Amino acid sequence: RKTRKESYAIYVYKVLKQVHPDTGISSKAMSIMNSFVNDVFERIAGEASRLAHYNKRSTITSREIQTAVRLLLPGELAKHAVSEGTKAVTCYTS
Amino acid sequence: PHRYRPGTVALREIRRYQKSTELLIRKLPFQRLVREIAQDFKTDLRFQSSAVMALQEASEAYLVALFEDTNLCAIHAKRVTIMPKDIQLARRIRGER
Amino acid sequence: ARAEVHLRKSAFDMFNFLASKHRQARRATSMDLPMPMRFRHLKKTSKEAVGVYRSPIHGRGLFCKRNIDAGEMVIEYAGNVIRSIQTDKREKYYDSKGIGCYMFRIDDSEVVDATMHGNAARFINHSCEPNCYSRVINIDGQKHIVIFAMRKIYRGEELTYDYKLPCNCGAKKCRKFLN
Amino acid sequence: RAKAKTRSSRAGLQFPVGRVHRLLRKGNYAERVGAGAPVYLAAVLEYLTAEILELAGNAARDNKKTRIIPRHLQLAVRNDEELNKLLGRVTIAQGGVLPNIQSVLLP
Amino acid sequence: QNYPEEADGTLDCISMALTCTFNRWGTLLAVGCNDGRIVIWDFLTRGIAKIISAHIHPVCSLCWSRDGHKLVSASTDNIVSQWDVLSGDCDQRFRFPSPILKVQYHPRDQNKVLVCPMKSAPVMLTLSDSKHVVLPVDDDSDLNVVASFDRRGEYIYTGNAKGKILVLKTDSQDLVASFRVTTGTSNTTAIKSIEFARKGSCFLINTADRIIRVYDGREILTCGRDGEPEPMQKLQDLVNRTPWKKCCFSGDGEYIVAGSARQHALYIWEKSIGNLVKILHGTRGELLLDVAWHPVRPIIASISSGVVSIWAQNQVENWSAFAPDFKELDENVEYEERESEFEDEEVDVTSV
Amino acid sequence: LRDNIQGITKPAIRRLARRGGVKRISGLIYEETRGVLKVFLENVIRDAVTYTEHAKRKTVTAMDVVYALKRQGRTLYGFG
Ligand SMILES: Nc1ncnc2c1ncn2[C@@H]1O[C@H](CSCC[C@H](N)C(=O)O)[C@@H](O)[C@H]1O
Numbered sequence: 085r086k087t088r089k090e091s092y093a094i095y096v097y098k099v100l101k102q103v104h105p106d107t108g109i110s111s112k113a114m115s116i117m118n119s120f121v122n123d124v125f126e127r128i129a130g131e132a133s134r135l136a137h138y139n140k141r142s143t144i145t146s147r148e149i150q151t152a153v154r155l156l157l158p159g160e161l162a163k164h165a166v167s168e169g170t171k172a173v174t175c176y177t178s
Numbered sequence: 179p180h181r182y183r184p185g186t187v188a189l190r191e192i193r194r195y196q197k198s199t200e201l202l203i204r205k206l207p208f209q210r211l212v213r214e215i216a217q218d219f220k221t222d223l224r225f226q227s228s229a230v231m232a233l234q235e236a237s238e239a240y241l242v243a244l245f246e247d248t249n250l251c252a253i254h255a256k257r258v259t260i261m262p263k264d265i266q267l268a269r270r271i272r273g274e275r
Numbered sequence: 276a277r278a279e280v281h282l283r284k285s286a287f288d289m290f291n292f293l294a295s296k297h298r299q300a301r302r303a304t305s306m307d308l309p310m311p312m313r314f315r316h317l318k319k320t321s322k323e324a325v326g327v328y329r330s331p332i333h334g335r336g337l338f339c340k341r342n343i344d345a346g347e348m349v350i351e352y353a354g355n356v357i358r359s360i361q362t363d364k365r366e367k368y369y370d371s372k373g374i375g376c377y378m379f380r381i382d383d384s385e386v387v388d389a390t391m392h393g394n395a396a397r398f399i400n401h402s403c404e405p406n407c408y409s410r411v412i413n414i415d416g417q418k419h420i421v422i423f424a425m426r427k428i429y430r431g432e433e434l435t436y437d438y439k440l441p442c443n444c445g446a447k448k449c450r451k452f453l454n
Numbered sequence: 455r456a457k458a459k460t461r462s463s464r465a466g467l468q469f470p471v472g473r474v475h476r477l478l479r480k481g482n483y484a485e486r487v488g489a490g491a492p493v494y495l496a497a498v499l500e501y502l503t504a505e506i507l508e509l510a511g512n513a514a515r516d517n518k519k520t521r522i523i524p525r526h527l528q529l530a531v532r533n534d535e536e537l538n539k540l541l542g543r544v545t546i547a548q549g550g551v552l553p554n555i556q557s558v559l560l561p
Numbered sequence: 562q563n564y565p566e567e568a569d570g571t572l573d574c575i576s577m578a579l580t581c582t583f584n585r586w587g588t589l590l591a592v593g594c595n596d597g598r599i600v601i602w603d604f605l606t607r608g609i610a611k612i613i614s615a616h617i618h619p620v621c622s623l624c625w626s627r628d629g630h631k632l633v634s635a636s637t638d639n640i641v642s643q644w645d646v647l648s649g650d651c652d653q654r655f656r657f658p659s660p661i662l663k664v665q666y667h668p669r670d671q672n673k674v675l676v677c678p679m680k681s682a683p684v685m686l687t688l689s690d691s692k693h694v695v696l697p698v699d700d701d702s703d704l705n706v707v708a709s710f711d712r713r714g715e716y717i718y719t720g721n722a723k724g725k726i727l728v729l730k731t732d733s734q735d736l737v738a739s740f741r742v743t744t745g746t747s748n749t750t751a752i753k754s755i756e757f758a759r760k761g762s763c764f765l766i767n768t769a770d771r772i773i774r775v776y777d778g779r780e781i782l783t784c785g786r787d788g789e790p791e792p793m794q795k796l797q798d799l800v801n802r803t804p805w806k807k808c809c810f811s812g813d814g815e816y817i818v819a820g821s822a823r824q825h826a827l828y829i830w831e832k833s834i835g836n837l838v839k840i841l842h843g844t845r846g847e848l849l850l851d852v853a854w855h856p857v858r859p860i861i862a863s864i865s866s867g868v869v870s871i872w873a874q875n876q877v878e879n880w881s882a883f884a885p886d887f888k889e890l891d892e893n894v895e896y897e898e899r900e901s902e903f904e905d906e907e908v909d910v911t912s913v
Numbered sequence: 914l915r916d917n918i919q920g921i922t923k924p925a926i927r928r929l930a931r932r933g934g935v936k937r938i939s940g941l942i943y944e945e946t947r948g949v950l951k952v953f954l955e956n957v958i959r960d961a962v963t964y965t966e967h968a969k970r971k972t973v974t975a976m977d978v979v980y981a982l983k984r985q986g987r988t989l990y991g992f993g
């Protein structure tokens with residue numbers, strides 16, 4: 085008899101078992117990765133909201149998420165992440 | 179035939195420049211510098227004038243703050259003249275590098 | 276002009292690499308970290324850190340193209356890990372062909388070939404005044420021949436070590452006998 | 455009325471999409487959340503998590519270990535240049551420092 | 562190898578380049594400049610071959626011939642002239658009604674060319690004289706009609722100003738197939754340009770509402786006259802909303818490349834699976850004009866204000882050509898080599 | 914273009930230092946100051962052109978410079 089808690093344990097677990105087929109992860113590193121995912125989500129959503137408020141709009145499209153990622157991440161990591169996102173949107177499209 | 183002992187003209191230049199407020203960099207070379215390093219990020223831009231003024235204000239305030247902290251470091255090192263390793267120490271302590 | 280049947284038309288060299296030019300803790304490999312962490316980044320450094328050009332001692336030398344700091348790895352000397360009596364058959368074979376011996380040993384049971392298979396680590400001359408040395412590590416049992424440094428080395432210097440015939444080093448206290 | 459394939463594997467991803475769209479509705483970031491913005495954002499989060507877990511698992515193997523303890527995450531973040539420029543002001547618990555002795559101290 | 566990845570130089574010699582096209586073989590590239598200059602390079606040794614300063618007027622369209630000798634002119638005074646790679650002289654000259662957009666030879670005869678005006682039906686002529694065959698189009702309302710041959714030379718696919726396709730025969734005008742595409746919800750929109758492959762019968766539909774559709778040159782003949790086919794593959798973009806300017810194909814019908822019109826970009830899809838696989842870039846603020854794919858090697862030529870960039874795979878040098886008996890290994894390769902320790906057939910040397 | 918990093922003259926760094934309170938200056942501060950100023954202007958102008966091309970215009974208004982300075986952490990009062 086407990087109230088449910090949102091988490092990210094299973095998803096980190098899945099990506100870890102894709103990229104390393106043997107190595108397990110303890111409790112504390114799981115808590116750290118949970119906090120890291122929440123942190124980057126807060127930064128990107130906040131910057132996109134401030135952009136869409138600046139330009140006299142009312143809608144967070146994908147274009148504002150692209151401009152927020154380009155403003156926030158440093159250089160080469162942004163150049164990879166933009167292409168990963170565009171590949172994902174194109175596969176979702178058709 | 180009279181020449182001052184060296185230092186007095188430096189001190190009165192310090193007082194005379196800390197008195198008033200003006201702009202200390204000529205605006206045509208600074209404007210050409212801004213257009214020059216803006217050329218490589220997007221071709222054929224078109225600046226307003228107040229944006230150039232804002233960049234000049236921000237750059238001048240940043241340089242003055244850097245020189246004050248550098249002179250604090252150099253007076254700590256029991257010297258007078260600023261060396262560039264003092265600038266590098268100040269920029270490494272502040273966290274920008 | 277068409278009157279010179281002139282000599283020096285034989286090379287006896289399979290390596291005609293020599294050209295006209297002959298130009299002479301921020302990272303991981305200089306840390307205090309455990310050894311395989313440096314051993315990974317070894318190969319990402321050694322493919323572009325150094326170079327091989329002509330030297331006055333014996334043909335081609337090793338002039339590095341990066342200011343190496345003291346204490347860190349440089350490059351691995353790897354090849355065919357031969358076993359100890361094929362050495363003598365290859366001595367007879369390369370005596371028959373006329374190409375010198377390139378054989379460093381990990382231990383006194385297994386030697387490592389370089390002439391048949393290897394890398395650019397063959398261009399390290401012997402000298403009695405070195406600035407590098409050698410230690411064998413244990414990357415999961417599969418041991419290696421990796422070369423550290425000794426002092427602060429700048430851009431444009433030959434790298435040597437002791438192999439333990441008159442030598443062409445010209446040392447201050449030279450032994451002149453490589454046995 | 456038929457089977458419903460999810461929005462997590464219709465794009466070939468791993469992080470959820472409905473949960474991200476709920477967190478963009480229940481936050482008042484703006485009025486009207488767009489069409490594929492949570493898909494784009496979940497792909498970005500996947501890429502960053504894979505990027506850090508690669509170095510984490512590699513260092514965990516290289517210290518002769520099988521599980522992961524946060525010292526490995528400390529090393530994997532503070533070794534690289536780009537993640538050190540991103541995660542500037544962050545204290546990982548149980549983290550530890552990087553070995554750095556100066557030039558003039560040791561004899 | 563495959564699709565290109567790296568920048569690999571340019572040819573910034575000739576001022577104000579405007580258009581470009583290839584031959585069948587992939588060694589001839591003429592450029593109609595901003596003043597009538599027609600310049601050919603080399604590709605193996607990359608030297609400027611022949612400047613043809615033909616007109617005082619700029620050139621907007623060109624085409625190569627099957628023998629590798631003949632070209633065709635399109636100036637701003639409607640002049641269509643027959644050229645040669647040996648002499649380079651003017652043959653034909655007359656005036657159309659004022660707009661001329663693009664020409665195209667017949668594939669299996671260098672007698673006939675297909676010429677397209679703006680506000681008229683496309684017209685086929687010969688090269689013997691000024692004979693012209695009137696081609697009928699179904700609408701005949703706006704007369705903004707595009708037309709092109711197929712690959713082998715069977716039919717002529719035409720595209721109106723309203724969104725209906727006719728399939729006619731090259732001489733007798735046999736309407737044998739037609740189809741209307743369900744363009745979105747309400748409006749059926751026009752077609753910019755339709756181009757055709759070299760292996761098979763696949764082609765593309767380039768509309769005016771920024772959606773690329775993939776079709777075959779046999780399914781429409783199977784559906785006959787007034788049928789409803791489906792797109793074999795839909796290609797579009799959503800993020801930047803991506804207007805298009807130029808479309809062409811890959812080497813042997815493997816991939817599809819399409820240059821953009823806003824961000825100076827090149828996109829590479831797959832006709833096989835159907836997903837985008839690589840994005841290219843370049844100068845941020847230029848204006849992309851003409852894109853040509855190289856038929857026997859992965860090279861793409863892109864004109865953006867004179868500059869012709871050649872993405873050419875960035876080859877990597879190594880050993881083992883110097884001493885082909887030494888193998889440059891990567892790690893420790895230990896083994897033992899030998900388990901056992903120690904005719905008059907006249908082949909033509911002139912086989913050309 | 915090549916110059917105008919050297920077009921910033923050399924009483925001007927002296928006058929900025931004597932607004933800041935500097936007595937005696939060596940002979941390397943000139944090139945060091947040119948380098949520092951070039952780095953800072955790059956890291957402002959890049960975000961300025963980003964906001965410009967996102968807004969779909971072809972000029973650089975003052976508000977974009979104020980926004981880039983505001984995100985860097987150096988707020989400017991006097992142009993908004
Ligand atoms: N001091 C020295 N002077 C000349 N040769 C030496 C030497 N010390 C060792 N040698 C021999 O020279 C070889 C070095 S290889 C020399 C570099 C390379 N082969 C070239 O093209 O020039 C070793 O195999 C060793 O047997």
Ligand SMILES: [Zn+2]
Binds near residue numbers: 403441442445446449
């Ligand atoms: Zn010697």
